[PDB]
């Protein structure tokens, strides 16, 4: 009975909130990403890095607060509180963007912690760790979007900032500069997210509407005993319903629930891959053949060309304020504009 | 001198339909980009 | 439309090769 074994005993005591060894990574880093976001949206500005107000203290609301990314001029600095930018000055760290890397790095380690926790608890209880495996897709999104994407660009300035309206701006930036909707990796991701919502809804509705009558009550929730041996709904009737409604139907309960893991998990992975390409400006921006025809044939128009006109308006109308460090000065006469508007 | 580790492999009909559907839908999606 | 000539073969093979693979595995499952 060494000290390591006694510490293992206590970390894996059955308690309201399980700790484990993974907890030594998870709880400090989760709490600090959380605490840091809350602190920064309550109290901290983006005035020196973005020219923006970003806290309740400045009179932002929940939609418009953010912990904003650091100034372009920091590059990919780790922005340590003791590092050469902030020199240990807490106040000036907040003002240069330190909380963004503070959250982004603690959050990345908290995510590692959470997955390790899934493995840890799964091993202790005796179950296969497919929940851990599925959680790989959130990790891949978070790592490609918040770390890889800016690392291929000039600086952390172009990562997402942590706020509601800040993320919308991200969204729209990606449309106007990257044409991200046209990217087949994002399409695949869309299909896996919508498809996963589809599956979620259709599975829950199917089961709720093929319950066996296992109690006399009009509320059907009390007629389920978790220890019971028997399926609580009819697979057989469900399969006939969908075979006749939709033409095919699941017959295998295990395949069905594996399919449910697979769809949304694979979708997020695919979109991750597309974003890695966008780190490099490796976009699916154009269709060359369309551009060659369009340029020679002023009467050739498609929805693809219409959307690019939109992209061009987004870029010109949003760049000076969105990328202030560039000092873009666009006289009115160069702003792209249709008639009247 | 026959190897003891050999196993038969299987692909049921349902798996074939799923795989065929995947490949055809992937081609329908990516073909526009192959042609560009 | 001045598309890429190799697009045709890339698409054709993209389809043919994985499909054939699945058909091989399926037909020999059926005959055993």
């Amino acid at each position: 009975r060494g000290w390591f074994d006694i510490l293992d005993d206590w970390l894996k005591r059955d308690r309201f909130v399980f700790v484990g060894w993974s907890g030594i990574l998870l709880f400090p880093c989760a709490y600090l990403a959380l605490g840091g976001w809350l602190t920064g949206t309550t109290f901290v500005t983006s005035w020196y890095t973005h020219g923006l107000a970003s806290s309740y203290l400045e009179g932002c609301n929940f939609l418009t607060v953010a912990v904003s990314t650091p100034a372009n001029s920091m590059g990919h600095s780790l922005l340590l509180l003791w590092g050469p930018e902030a020199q240990g000055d807490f106040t000036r760290w907040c003002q240069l963007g330190g909380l963004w890397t503070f959250i982004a790095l603690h959050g990345a380690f908290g995510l590692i912690g959470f997955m390790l926790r899934q493995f840890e608890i799964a091993r202790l209880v005796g179950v296969r760790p497919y929940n851990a495996i599925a959680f790989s897709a959130p990790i891949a999104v978070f790592v490609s979007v918040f770390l890889i994407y800016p690392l291929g660009q000039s600086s952390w300035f172009f990562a997402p900032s942590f706020g509601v309206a800040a993320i919308f701006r991200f969204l729209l930036f990606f449309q106007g500069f990257h044409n991200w909707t046209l990217n087949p990796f994002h399409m695949m991701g869309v299909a896996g997210v919508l498809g996963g919502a589809l599956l979620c809804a259709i599975h829950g509705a199917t089961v709720e509407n093929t319950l066996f009558q296992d109690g006399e009550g009009a509320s059907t929730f009390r007629a389920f005993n978790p220890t019971q041996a028997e399926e609580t709904y009819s697979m057989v009737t469900a399969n006939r319903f969908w075979s006749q409604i939709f033409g095919i139907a699941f017959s295998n309960k295990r395949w069905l629930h594996f399919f449910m893991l697979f769809v949304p998990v694979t979708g997020l992975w695919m979109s991750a891959i597309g974003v890695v390409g966008l780190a490099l400006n490796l976009r699916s921006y154009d269709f060359i053949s369309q551009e060659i025809r369009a340029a020679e044939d002023p009467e050739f128009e498609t929805f693809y060309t219409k959307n690019l006109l939109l992209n061009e308006g987004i870029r010109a109308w949003m760049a000076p304020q969105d990328q202030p460090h560039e000092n873009f000065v666009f006289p009115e006469e160069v702003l792209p504009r249709g008639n009247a508007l | 001198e026959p190897n003891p580790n050999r196993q038969p492999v299987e692909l049921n009909r349902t798996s074939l339909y799923l795989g065929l559907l995947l490949i055809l839908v992937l081609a329908l999606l990516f073909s526009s980009y192959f042609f560009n | 439309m001045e598309v890429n000539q190799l697009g045709l073969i890339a698409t054709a093979l993209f389809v043919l090769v994985p499909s054939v693979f699945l058909i091989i595995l399926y037909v020999q499952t059926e005959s055993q």
């Binding site: - | 349902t14 065929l20 839908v25 073909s31 042609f35 | 598309v3 045709l8």
Partner: peptide, 30 residues
Amino acid sequence: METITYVFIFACIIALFFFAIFFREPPRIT
């Protein structure tokens, strides 16, 4: 050539639907 390709692939999918519904492995209660 590209129009033919798109329609070809679309047409293979509709035929797959037909086989997948009417020539599925019947689910048997075993």
